[PDB]
Amino acid sequence: LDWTTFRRVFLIDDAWRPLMEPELANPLTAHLLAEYNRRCQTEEVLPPREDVFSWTRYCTPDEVRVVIIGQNPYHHPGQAHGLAFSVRANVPPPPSLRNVLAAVKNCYPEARMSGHGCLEKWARDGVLLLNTTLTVKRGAAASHSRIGWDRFVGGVIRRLAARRPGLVFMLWGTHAQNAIRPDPRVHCVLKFSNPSPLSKVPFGTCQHFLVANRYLETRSISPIDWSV
Ligand SMILES: O=c1ccn([C@H]2C[C@H](O)[C@@H](CO)O2)c(=O)[nH]1
């Protein structure tokens, strides 16, 4: 796998090169990319190719302050755009995102919320919203969960963590908690139940947004304005 070509095909911003280029030397990455291309030739795959790595464009690795792990992208046209949980700005927030935003509002009663679910503002501020599976077949939830994205994304996150001590991780649900296992002595690891509508545990009481900011302050890092 050649970086220049990989970067050009996915419109990846070059600041992420040191964290992603090494993944191209792993033989399994080639297998993953071949399967992804195969899928694209036989299925309507989402999000559009140009958005699969949008997360590399909103901020650089050194700007990342918080990492929020997702599972699979939304599988309906017009929803997913490369960031975990986020939807394009004309889409009413789907249930799990609605649940996340309710907790944000509970944490920050004075937050001026927009009503939309596009998290571009958080991403530009260094909130890395990364799904462990980056693509999906339209109309079939979690359909690409076994093609190999999770190992690739895991590699990137592991490299980011080693390069960047003091990150805050928000691991919501069993899947996120099993896939990502940061050293709790080097990073702030926050766990909660899934904001998924299937969870019978209210996500509205999640105080991670506030806990994260207190942690960043003890490390002399500016806090995140969670309004969106
Ligand atoms: O980018 C996304 C979109 C959705 N979901 C999740 C939350 C929940 O498990 C289900 C949506 O109800 O998929 C993610 O993890 N990442």
From Swiss-Prot:
The chain holds residues 107 to 334 of 334 of the full protein. This is Uracil-DNA glycosylase. One of its GO terms (molecular function) is uracil DNA N-glycosylase activity. Excises uracil residues from the DNA which can arise as a result of misincorporation of dUMP residues by DNA polymerase or deamination of cytosines. Therefore may reduce deleterious uracil incorporation into the viral genome, particularly in terminally differentiated cells which lack DNA repair enzymes. One of its GO terms (biological process) is base-excision repair, AP site formation via deaminated base removal. GO terms for cellular component: host cell nucleus. It catalyses: Hydrolyzes single-stranded DNA or mismatched double-stranded DNA and polynucleotides, releasing free uracil. The keyword Chaperone does not apply. The keyword DNA repair applies. The active site is at residue 72. Belongs to the uracil-DNA glycosylase (UDG) superfamily. UNG family. It is an enzyme of class 3 (hydrolase). It is found in: Host nucleus. Signal peptide: none annotated. Its main location: host cell. It comes from Human herpesvirus 1 (strain 17). Its EC number is 3.2.2.27. Keywords: DNA damage, DNA repair, Host nucleus, Hydrolase.
